[PDB]
Amino acid sequence: ELPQMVQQLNSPDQQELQSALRKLSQIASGGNEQIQKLIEAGALSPLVKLLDDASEEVIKNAVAAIANIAAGNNEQIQKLIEAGALSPLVKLLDDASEEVIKNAVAAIANIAAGNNEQIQKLIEAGALSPLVKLLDDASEEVIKNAVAAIANIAAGNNEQIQKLIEAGALSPLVKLLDDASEEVIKNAVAAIANIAAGNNEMKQKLEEAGALPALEKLQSHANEEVQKNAQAALEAFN
């Protein structure tokens, strides 16, 4: 069954391709068990190879599917890295299609929710600079996923945190503390709370970026969850 569907990803017949990516997309949204079947049927390489396809809609749907695989356990994120997903995902961050970028950012956020070695592979694949750029970008949905990726990276090791900072993440993150979106604010606050847990160079860099007044302002944001997160971030500075 699934082997047949995997073969169809490589079919030049466009409605059969679309159909195969359909079903696979469906399975990938099942749990980790479902993802595991896909891994074991060899779906990953052919999926990554679709990220270079002529149709932006195939790219969009192939990337959505990879985003869903990457929401699996750390063994399954590992399998994506070993399929070469990371460099094409990063290339897509300046895709001509905002919908493709949105989904490529979601995939990279998921991967960054993996372990420190998976964060590291993202860094080595050049993810940080384009992500920082997407923090200031015409589309809320792109910004939302981009801060979620930066937050996830900020949960890594102190080496990776210094890389975030050197990529210029701090002032865009401080700006996002005033975003119109509550989802955006909570991920910006999380990122900043992660960075604040690090050294005093890092705490000082945050004060420098203007984090303190921006966090204090959120103590009166309409949503109480936001106030509370903001206060817990202020408390990470001790």
Side-chain angles (χ1 to χ4, degrees):
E1 183 51 326
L2 270 50
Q4 193 31 255
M5 170 202 84
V6 163
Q7 210 197 346
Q8 292 167 349
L9 303 184
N10 317 274
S11 158
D13 173 335
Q14 296 310 285
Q15 43 289 343
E16 193 189 356
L17 164 59
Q18 199 203 6
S19 215
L21 247 190
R22 276 265 170 277
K23 290 148 203 46
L24 184 159
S25 283
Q26 206 210 349
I27 294 144
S29 57
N32 293 7
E33 282 167 50
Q34 293 290 265
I35 292 158
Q36 194 52 37
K37 310 191 85 173
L38 285 176
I39 287 170
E40 285 164 352
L44 268 53
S45 253
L47 269 190
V48 174
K49 190 212 150 203
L50 287 176
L51 305 183
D52 271 310
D53 192 84
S55 161
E56 296 270 39
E57 179 78 355
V58 52
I59 296 172
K60 184 203 84 184
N61 288 307
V63 176
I66 295 170
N68 267 332
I69 294 155
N73 63 47
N74 291 354
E75 290 222 349
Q76 305 167 317
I77 293 173
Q78 255 313 306
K79 291 290 126 96
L80 275 166
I81 290 163
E82 299 168 351
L86 264 34
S87 279
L89 286 176
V90 165
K91 165 174 60 42
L92 288 169
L93 270 20
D94 59 24
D95 192 86
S97 156
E98 252 176 77
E99 212 56 51
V100 169
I101 295 180
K102 175 220 273 41
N103 288 276
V105 187
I108 287 176
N110 292 347
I111 296 161
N115 64 42
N116 291 350
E117 290 317 286
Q118 304 167 335
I119 292 166
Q120 190 55 32
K121 283 310 171 48
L122 283 172
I123 289 180
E124 289 165 352
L128 265 32
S129 274
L131 287 178
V132 150
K133 250 240 268 34
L134 302 166
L135 291 183
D136 197 26
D137 210 64
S139 167
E140 183 272 326
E141 322 188 54
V142 175
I143 295 177
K144 163 69 185 274
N145 287 330
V147 209
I150 295 302
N152 294 352
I153 292 153
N157 70 34
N158 280 312
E159 169 154 70
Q160 294 163 340
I161 289 170
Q162 176 56 11
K163 305 272 163 203
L164 266 185
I165 286 164
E166 291 166 3
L170 298 196
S171 104
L173 249 12
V174 164
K175 189 279 226 271
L176 270 9
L177 300 175
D178 204 12
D179 200 72
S181 174
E182 287 185 22
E183 276 325 314
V184 169
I185 294 155
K186 292 190 291 191
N187 293 329
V189 167
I192 290 183
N194 292 316
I195 300 167
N199 76 37
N200 297 46
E201 191 63 78
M202 297 165 180
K203 297 175 167 52
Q204 157 203 291
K205 288 282 168 112
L206 289 162
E207 298 173 359
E208 311 208 319
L212 310 182
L215 286 167
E216 281 197 359
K217 183 146 191 277
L218 292 171
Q219 276 170 331
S220 65
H221 188 280
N223 181 287
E224 95 163 310
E225 176 68 2
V226 175
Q227 308 184 351
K228 271 169 163 182
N229 297 355
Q231 208 212 285
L234 277 170
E235 275 163 4
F237 265 86
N238 25 58

